[PDB]
Swiss-Prot record:
This protein's name: CLIP-associating protein 2
Gene: CLASP2
Subunit structure: Interacts with microtubules. Interacts with MAPRE1; probably required for targeting to the growing microtubule plus ends. Interacts with CLIP2, ERC1, MAPRE3, PHLDB2 and RSN. The interaction with ERC1 may be mediated by PHLDB2. Interacts with GCC2; recruits CLASP2 to Golgi membranes. Interacts with MACF1. Interacts with mtcl2 and MTCL1.
Residues of the full protein shown: 1058 to 1280 of 1294
Tissue: Brain-specific.
Annotated function: Microtubule plus-end tracking protein that promotes the stabilization of dynamic microtubules. Involved in the nucleation of noncentrosomal microtubules originating from the trans-Golgi network (TGN). Required for the polarization of the cytoplasmic microtubule arrays in migrating cells towards the leading edge of the cell. May act at the cell cortex to enhance the frequency of rescue of depolymerizing microtubules by attaching their plus-ends to cortical platforms composed of ERC1 and PHLDB2.
Family membership noted in the UniProt record: Belongs to the CLASP family.
Cellular localisation: Cytoplasm, Cytoskeleton; Cytoplasm, Cytoskeleton, Microtubule organizing center, Centrosome; Chromosome, Centromere, Kinetochore; Cytoplasm, Cytoskeleton, Spindle
Natural source organism: Homo sapiens (Human)
Post-translational changes noted in the entry: Phosphorylated by GSK3B. Phosphorylation reduces MAPRE1 binding. Phosphorylation by GSK3B may negatively regulate binding to microtubule lattices in lamella.
Repeat (HEAT) residue spans along the chain: 1-34, 41-78, 159-196
Highest taxon listed in the record's lineage: Eukaryota
Domain notes from UniProt: The two SXIP sequence motifs mediate interaction with MAPRE1; this is necessary for targeting to growing microtubule plus ends.
Length: 243
């Protein structure tokens, strides 16, 4: 009874904004209660309605829907086995929102998604996204790829390199420093797994880009403020690498 009521309320279009936020928070509540029988009967219906709600014109509804999505990912990760590409694609797409709150909520959902999704399957969908998507969806995809690369074996990673590498080499040439930095950090993660077997894949990198990558590899080996500091430091170090 309750679930049908919540779904009907959330099916309302362009009206009843506060009542729909209550319905989303009731879904969040059921998720925090576990409500295992609700998911046994209604997982598909709830997930698909939630993903539609990502397209709502109200930013506070989009952000809240992403918070609910994150909770369902945390509590019911196994059921996403059959919705992997859909959930990755919708979550990445939300990163291009004009409203910072929606982007932040998409980032938080993406962080959780990266730890549950089958890693090889995730890497495979991210590769063409990284090569084709607009900024900052490409950025989000590279950051997700880094997290899933951290979850595969050397043997698996070596098999996936021919698909992974072109996007990282391309992204290292992007005009956005955030994308270049994300690519450097992804390459550091790849190197952490396969070591100097990365070498032949890097032949297209210029001297300055190799120097900068080497600097960050050495840092990883030797050891809000920290993040912002790191982002600016990357720009200064990159500047120095090109002189
Ligand atoms: Cl399950």
């Amino acid at each position: 009874d309750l679930v049908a009521e919540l779904l009907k309320e959330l099916s309302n279009h362009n009206e009843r904004v506060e009542e729909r936020k209550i319905a989303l928070y009731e879904l969040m509540k059921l998720t925090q209660e576990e409500s295992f029988s609700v998911w046994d009967e209604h997982f598909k219906t709830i997930l698909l309605l939630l993903l539609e709600t990502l397209g709502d014109k109200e930013p506070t509804i989009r952000a809240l829907a992403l918070k609910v999505l994150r909770e369902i990912l945390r509590h019911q990760p196994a059921r996403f086995k059959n919705y992997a590409e859909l959930t990755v694609m919708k979550t990445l797409e939300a990163h291009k929102d004009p409203h910072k709150e929606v982007v932040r909520s998409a980032e938080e959902a993406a962080s959780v998604l990266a730890t549950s999704i089958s890693p090889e399957q995730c890497i495979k969908v991210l590769c063409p996204i990284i090569q084709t998507a607009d900024y900052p969806i490409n950025l989000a995809a590279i950051k997700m790829q880094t997290k899933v690369i951290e979850r595969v074996s050397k043997e698996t990673l070596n098999l996936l390199l021919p698909e992974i590498m072109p996007g990282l080499i391309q992204g290292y040439d992007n005009s956005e420093s955030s994308v270049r930095k994300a690519c450097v950090f992804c390459l550091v993660a790849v190197h952490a797994v396969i070591g100097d077997e990365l070498k032949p894949h890097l032949s297209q990198l210029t001297g300055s880009k190799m120097k900068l990558l080497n600097l960050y590899i050495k840092r990883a080996q030797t050891g809000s403020g920290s993040k912002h500091f790191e982002d600016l430091e990357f720009q200064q170090l990159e500047h120095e690498s090109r002189l």
